[PDB]
Paper text:
In tRNA, the epigenetic m3C modification at position 32 in the anticodon loop is highly conserved in eukaryotes, which maintains the folding and basepairing functions of the anticodon. A study showed that METTL6 catalyzes the methylation of C32 in several tRNASer isoacceptors. Methylation is most common, and it can be catalyzed by a large family of methyltransferase-like proteins (METTLs) that transfer the methyl group from S-adenosylmethionine (SAM) to a variety of positions in RNA nucleosides. The loss of human METTL6 (hMETTL6) affects the translational process and proteostasis in cells, while in mESCs cells, it leads to defective pluripotency potential.
Author numbering: -10 to 247, 257 to 273
Amino acid sequence: HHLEVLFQGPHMASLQRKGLQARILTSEEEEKLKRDQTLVSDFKQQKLEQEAQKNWDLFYKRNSTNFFKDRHWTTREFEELRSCREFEDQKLTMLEAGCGVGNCLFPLLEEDPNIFAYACDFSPRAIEYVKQNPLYDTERCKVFQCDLTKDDLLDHVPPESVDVVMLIFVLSAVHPDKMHLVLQNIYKVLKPGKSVLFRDYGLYDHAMLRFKASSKLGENFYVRQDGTRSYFFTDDFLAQLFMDTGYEEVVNEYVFREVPRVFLQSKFLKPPKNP
Ligand SMILES: Nc1ncnc2c1ncn2[C@@H]1O[C@H](CSCC[C@H](N)C(=O)O)[C@@H](O)[C@H]1O
């Protein structure tokens, strides 16, 4: 059960945008949310940015937590991985950028036994989780520490060697002013003609509506109780980031999932090389 729709035309698109917003968001509760979510202090916002890696690492050090997520994958990403593969067992090279404990990595590794995955995260405890997974295998997976906003992926990944990059619930954790750095870093490992598969929180997702006072860092940008952060993307903001860093939009769609979750799921192409 799914229904996919594309609205074209200035008037048609705007009318639908506002209709869907009003069906999730009470239109007067919009003003209420903006007044109630008062802004975190500059001092604390600086600390949260400086401690981005530390707060994720502390999250992964928790006990009493099932970090693993069944059904976290999607049919859409699996189909994208079957595209342009002549043989089911053909070698395919991927990067799972911001891999966490591997909830996207390991399901993808069971798709094609000659998938080779680079995988990186800035949390050392996440990387240890990856390396201790039952499915971990150095002939299938090269995992390494990398802060995507400032460590060059080329230190570990040969240039233009990757057939697909996954960027799944990662970019929303990055400061909006630094998101472009992440995509520029990724650009250099991706083969011309190949894509980033993106999925992340979207505007007016349930989580955004639940955040309270002194959780708001900025428009669409919140800190969670564990100090990690979530930005809630609009389609246009996300497309502009990718266009500004050299990609072409293929797919860029809101996903409504029923509790009304709002995600953005997208596919952005690195252009074929020219003359
Ligand atoms: N600047 C950065 N560089 C590298 N990893 C980052 C990062 N900012 C956030 N992360 C990582 O992004 C992850 C988000 S959780 C999503 C993990 C995985 N892609 C999945 O789909 O399950 C966390 O593991 C966090 O440590």
